[PDB]
Write a protein that binds this ligand. Structure first.
Ligand code: SF4
Ligand code: SF4
Ligand code: SF4
Ligand code: FES
Ligand code: FES
Ligand SMILES: [Ca+2]
Lengths: 905, 147, 156
């Protein structure tokens, strides 16, 4: 369409809002209640402009930019007298009752209300009466809440109810005494409550974890990185101050993770600033530990490796592609073992085969929301990686969206869409062992063991296409439910099949592939996605290697006398006693890691590897795209004794000193050249971010804002003589303020969102070609996969029905969000949020055991009789006991494993 | 009584038109009187009004087409359909057709409520229908609609 | 510890029988709890949410939005005096002073024995009949400050 703003012609979209069309042109209209991902309401009246119909008009009408469609022939005006003074009156009405507590506010220089108060140009106060005050609420360990700062813009409840689907927060109040929160005091049980810090334009909902050890936004040294907590790989902006990581911000990327993070990735950054982390190369000699620098530690490690006869490199899914390849080059290629179990590696390889050889397009996180039906097989999506679950919520709301669009109403007014919808949902069929958080909006939920979920998928694939292998023994009511599922999926334009390796069985992945092939064979636009376990598990599968059990057999047999374990706990992927015995039998154990694990004891050398806040690396998504994360700070800037070098740097220098007896501190793009010249499947990772010699208009990119404070007194407590800024040869980023963070810069990766006059998280709209859409000049990361021309075959192996037995108990995975990751559970803030280690029993199983809820029972695994209190689960089945995977002492390998001796303690 | 008399139910006097009537007693907020907020309050939500032009005649209560009308409009319609349309246009020679329930209130001698045709001035109502005001009052102001 | 009586559940279910969406009966469920117990306690919000199926945040917002859904405990007789403009012209400050001198309280608070709770009301719809008030769903018009103690002695 063609509009005229300020007596000037512009060409904008026709079906979008006028506010987003004007913001996509770079013009400045203040707003409080409109969000690009939440639609438009009238909770404020801040976006007021003056509209004229004809080309020439005198009076016009004061309209809202977020309520006016950007149609052909509108002549609106922004900086006239009346609209500007009306917006000044609206910000005056917002400052009518606002507390005078800006310097003691967690927003401060990150506050949208300050930016829009300054932008409207209101400084003189004419209000002389009393203000409005409210009490406070305890909203858990993550969201600090205080109601005085609010302006009643209704964005929090709009996100939390319509978008996030949470059933906790809401509006309780009246004309002026309007309250936003919880009817009681308690933790917000939604997994997306951490996005309220950036959704709220005021300091009502703030980061409690950042409130403790707080610094302002301009003091934050930011970096563009990837969240390492699970496989969704949401683009994040970690920001540090005084040598510790302080705040993770949402980093905009229009392909994956546009506006919202999950709670785990938002609040699981407390492990990188732990005080028990390995910060020095520590080698134990005799019975006491000595501390070395990098040089003599590398020399000694290379001498012991030269004196050894065979080296085993045990990688990890938590490590980067560059670090795992550096290990793969340090040890021989024929002996390099992936740090996962045999069943886990089989599930990962089958998932990769489905991804890159099934011939079915795998959707990204943004385009999951555009699909017409969702079938989730055996995956706790809301608890493993919750961003796909949020996208599934949006895809469910897509039916109400399209039904509203059929009534010729606009798509940016979410109130009319939810008016027309009225609990009209796309078909969502979730299968899990127990109840999920998606059951509120699901068309159907199937509570069954993993084999029964796989058989349900096989029945769905057989009903969709007769070429699939048939499964017998289906009950007529279950057959009717299969008929309902397949007539919902056959009538869907773009069906979606979601699975994962966290189900604990190959047959669920096989059933998901069979259903996707059956949907593709009849001409549907089916997509399939698999949620992997760790952040770079799929990259480890692409690179490949032996399983952990093969390496343990090699260590126990004695064929290798030297083992190098890279960033792996080794207890989550195998049994603890066998791993401890194999590592004790090895004459040389080197552990390259950044976290104090249980294998550092009786380990001959410990290399202080760098975490994602202190290292550069490449991680591969669950979708299949390869993104890369950058360093946030130099660990040697403060406490210069520590080195904390990158894992790939450590292993490559070890390899170079093994060969030529010389230490080489190489560069990251050399390792990228190595991985694209050695592995043809990883040849595409040199397209996510460019070379380190990439300078737009001659200069680098800044980690920190232009108002970085205290540069001559930050390190003055130990030395007044200011040290040189840390020179970064690995990346295209300088560690200090003299870079470039201009929104109109030809780049794909942005450290942080800051524009002149836009100091809020709502400053990301200046970095996009259209606001709420894709990022300008492309998106970070490249796909690395193509849809295959010819798919796989139908998987004939249909599993049998799960028949319970009295002596043997089947372990059912649960995967709690705040407790199914080692890196998450090492954070001190998750301990008050994570539930206590429990076990789950059927009512019939609890009756046959004679125990009640809350009573300790003892179960024996690996010769250890460990005791846990029970919980009665209605959705669980007989013969199964439920366990939270990833716990302390409960490895995720046990998912699908058997259990014995369920006796009361 | 209407349900007992065969009306207001199923097949009303042998027509096949099915209609059911309910009474919803609100708890009481003045914003509930507006049609969109009345629709929002009828759905069991907070009585916030709705934006336009998604109209209640296209998408109102529960996404269905609705019409909200006042008591006096629905009290004037059956007289229209029982006595005729030309009779309804031939009761007052004014642009506003029909009768209205007018009346003065506030320190008046006879504050009441009378049905009068449109085009009737407030002065004659105040002096004859309201009977004038009480002793020692000078009538410094008035308001046509209530508050 | 709140629980719902059987008559409450039958009345609420019969009210949800009248509407397409069970959410539409939340206001009437709160009104039923108000008619039986006099006010809506904290557990009643969760009870209505569990019976209806809507979350407790919506029920709490509905209870805290409408004026005549009391969440604080009130007395056995809720005096609701008019605070609008027609009764202001007819005179409601005199009857307000009479109530404040009789009950020795302020509007919005209850008496010490729990006998009366004084509250202003937006309007009563009885504007032509002078100043108006409601006590326990009983309306009163043409009020005078002298007749307030006579009017207040017929309630338990
Ligand atoms: S708490 Fe924040 S997001 Fe919610 S209405 Fe108030 S200002 Fe808006
Ligand atoms: S929310 Fe913004 S305007 Fe309010 S006190 Fe905090 S910094 Fe100041
Ligand atoms: S969904 Fe996974 S990758 Fe995304 S923020 Fe959460 S833990 Fe991190
Ligand atoms: S942005 Fe709030 S009225 Fe448009
Ligand atoms: S103004 Fe008091 S009853 Fe209406
Ligand atoms: Ca670096």
């Amino acid at each position: 369409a063609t509009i005229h703003v300020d007596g000037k012609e512009y060409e904008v979209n026709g079906a979008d809002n006028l506010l987003e069309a004007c913001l996509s042109l770079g013009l400045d209209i203040p707003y409080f209640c409109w969000h690009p991902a939440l639609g438009s309401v009238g909770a404020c009246r801040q976006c007021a402009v003056k509209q004229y119909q004809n080309a020439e008009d005198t009076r016009g009408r004061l309209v809202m930019s977020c309520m006016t469609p950007a149609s052909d022939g509108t002549f609106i005006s922004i900086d006239d007298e009346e609209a500007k003074q009306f917006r000044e009156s609206v910000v005056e009405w917002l400052m009518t009752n606002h507390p005078h507590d800006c310097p003691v506010c967690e927003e401060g220089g990150n506050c949208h209300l300050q930016d829009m108060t300054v932008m409207t140009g209101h400084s003189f106060r004419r209000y002389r009466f009393t203000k409005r005050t409210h009490r406070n609420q305890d909203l858990g360990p993550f969201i600090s809440h205080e109601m005085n700062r609010c302006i009643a813009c209704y964005r929090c409840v709009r996100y939390y109810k319509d978008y996030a689907g949470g059933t906790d927060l809401g509006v309780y109040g009246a004309h002026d005494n309007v309250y936003f929160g919880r009817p009681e005091d308690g933790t917000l049980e939604s997994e997306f409550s951490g996005n309220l810090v950036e959704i709220c334009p005021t300091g009502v909902f703030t980061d409690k974890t950042h409130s403790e050890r707080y610094n302002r936004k301009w003091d934050m040294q930011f970096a563009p990185s990837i969240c390492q907590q699970c496989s969704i790989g949401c683009n994040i902006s970690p920001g540090e101050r005084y040598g510790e990581l302080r705040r993770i911000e949402n980093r905009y990327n229009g392909t994956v993770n546009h506006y919202f993070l999950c709670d785990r990735g938002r609040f699981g950054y407390g492990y990188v600033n732990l005080k028990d982390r390995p910060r020095q190369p520590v080698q134990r000699r005799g019975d006491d530990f000595i501390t070395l620098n990098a040089e003599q530690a590398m020399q000694g490690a290379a001498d012991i490796l030269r004196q050894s006869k065979k080296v085993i490199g045990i990688g990890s899914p938590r490590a980067s592609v560059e670090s795992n390849f550096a290990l793969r080059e340090l040890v021989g290629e024929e002996n390099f073992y992936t740090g996962i179990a045999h069943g886990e590696q089989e599930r990962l390889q089958l998932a990769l085969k489905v991804l890159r050889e099934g011939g079915i397009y795998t959707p990204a996180l943004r385009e999951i929301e555009s699909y017409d039906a969702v079938l989730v097989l055996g995956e706790d999506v809301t608890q493993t990686g919750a961003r796909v679950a949020l996208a599934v919520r949006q895809a469910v709301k897509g039916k109400a969206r399209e039904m509203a669009a059929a009534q010729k109403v606009a798509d940016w007014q979410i109130a009319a869409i939810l008016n027309i919808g009225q609990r009209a949902k796309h078909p969502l069929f979730v299968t899990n062992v127990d109840d999920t958080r998606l059951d509120d909006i699901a068309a159907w939920t199937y509570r069954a063991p993993v084999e029964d979920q796989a058989r349900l998928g096989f029945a769905i694939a057989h009903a969709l296409d007769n070429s699939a292998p048939a499964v017998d023994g289906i009950e007529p009511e279950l057959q009717s439910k299969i008929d309902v599922i397949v007539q919902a999926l056959a009538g869907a334009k773009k069906p979606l099949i979601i699975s994962g390796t966290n189900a604990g069985s190959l047959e669920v992945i096989q059933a998901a592939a069979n259903v996707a092939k059956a949907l593709k064979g009849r001409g549907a636009d089916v997509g399939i996605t698999m949620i992997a376990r760790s952040v770079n598990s799929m990259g480890l599968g692409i690179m490949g290697g032996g399983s952990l059990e093969e390496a343990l057999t090699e260590l126990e047999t004695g064929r290798a006398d030297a083992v190098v374990v890279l960033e792996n706990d080794l207890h989550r992927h195998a049994s603890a006693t066998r791993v401890n015995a194999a590592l004790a039998k090895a004459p040389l154990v080197m552990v390259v890691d950044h976290q104090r694990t249980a294998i550092m004891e009786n380990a001959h050398l410990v290399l202080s590897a760098a975490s994602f806040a202190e290292s550069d690396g490449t991680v591969i998504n669950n979708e299949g795209r390869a993104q890369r994360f950058f360093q946030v700070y130099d660990p040697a800037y403060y406490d210069s004794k520590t080195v904390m070098l990158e894992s790939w740097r450590w292993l490559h220098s070890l390899h170079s000193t093994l060969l030529s007896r010389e230490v080489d501190w190489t560069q990251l793009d050399h390792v990228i050249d190595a991985v694209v010249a050695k592995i043809p499947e990883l040849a595409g990772i040199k397209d996510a971010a460019p070379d380190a010699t990439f300078r737009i208009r001659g200069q680098k990119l800044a980690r920190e804002p232009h108002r970085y404070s205290g540069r001559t007194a930050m390190r003055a407590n130990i030395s007044v003589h200011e040290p040189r800024q840390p020179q970064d040869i690995d990346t295209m980023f300088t560690f200090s303020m003299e870079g470039n963070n201009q929104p109109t810069a030809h780049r794909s990766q942005v450290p942080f969102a800051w524009a002149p006059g836009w100091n809020s998280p709502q400053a990301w709209n200046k970095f996009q070609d259209e606001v709420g859409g894709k990022l300008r000049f492309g998106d970070p990361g490249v796909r690395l996969f193509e849809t295959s021309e010819n798919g796989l075959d139908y998987f004939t192996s249909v599993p049998a029905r799960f028949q319970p037995q009295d002596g043997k108990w089947r372990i059912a995975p649960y995967y709690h969000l705040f407790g199914s990751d080692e890196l998450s559970q090492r954070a001190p803030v998750f301990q008050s949020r994570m539930p206590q280690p429990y076990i789950k029993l059927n009512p019939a199983d609890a009756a046959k055991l004679g125990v009640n809820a809350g009573t300790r029972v003892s179960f024996s695994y690996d010769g250890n009789t460990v005791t846990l209190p029970v919980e009665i689960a209605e959705g669980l089945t007989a013969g199964q006991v439920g366990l939270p995977m990833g716990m302390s002492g409960i490895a995720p390998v046990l998912a699908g494993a058997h259990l014995e001796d369920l006796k009361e303690a | 009584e209407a349900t007992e008399a065969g009306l207001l139910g199923k097949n009303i006097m042998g027509t096949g038109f099915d209609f059911e009537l309910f009474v919803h007693t609100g708890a009481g907020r003045y914003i509930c009187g507006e049609e969109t907020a009345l629709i929002n309050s009828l759905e069991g939500r907070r009585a916030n009004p709705r934006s336009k032009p998604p109209f209640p005649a296209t998408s109102g209560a529960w996404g269905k087409p609705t019409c909200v009308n006042n008591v006096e409009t629905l009290c004037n319609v059956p007289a229209i359909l029982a006595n005729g349309v030309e009779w309804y246009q031939n009761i007052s020679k004014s642009k506003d057709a029909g009768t209205k329930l007018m009346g003065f209130s506030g320190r008046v001698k006879n504050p009441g409520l009378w049905e009068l045709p449109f085009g009737t001035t407030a002065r004659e109502i105040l002096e004859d229908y309201a009977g004038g005001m009480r002793d020692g009052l000078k009538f410094k102001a008035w308001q046509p609609g209530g508050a | 510890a709140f629980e719902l009586s059987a008559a409450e559940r039958e009345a609420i279910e019969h009210e949800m029988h009248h509407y397409e969406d069970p959410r539409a009966a939340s206001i009437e469920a709160l009104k039923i709890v108000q008619k039986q117990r006099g006010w809506v306690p904290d557990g009643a919000i969760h009870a209505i949410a569990d019976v209806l199926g809507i979350p407790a945040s919506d029920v709490e917002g509905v209870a805290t939005f409408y004026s005549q859904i009391f969440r604080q405990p009130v007395g056995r007789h809720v005096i609701r005096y008019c605070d609008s403009v027609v009764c202001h012209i007819n005179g409601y400050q005199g009857i307000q002073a009479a109530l404040e001198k009789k009950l020795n309280i302020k509007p919005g608070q209850t008496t010490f024995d729990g006998r009366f709770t004084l509250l202003p009301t937006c309007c009563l719809g009885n504007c032509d009949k002078g100043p108006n008030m409601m006590i326990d769903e009983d309306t009163h018009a043409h009020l005078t400050p002298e007749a307030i103690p006579e009017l207040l002695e017929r309630y338990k």
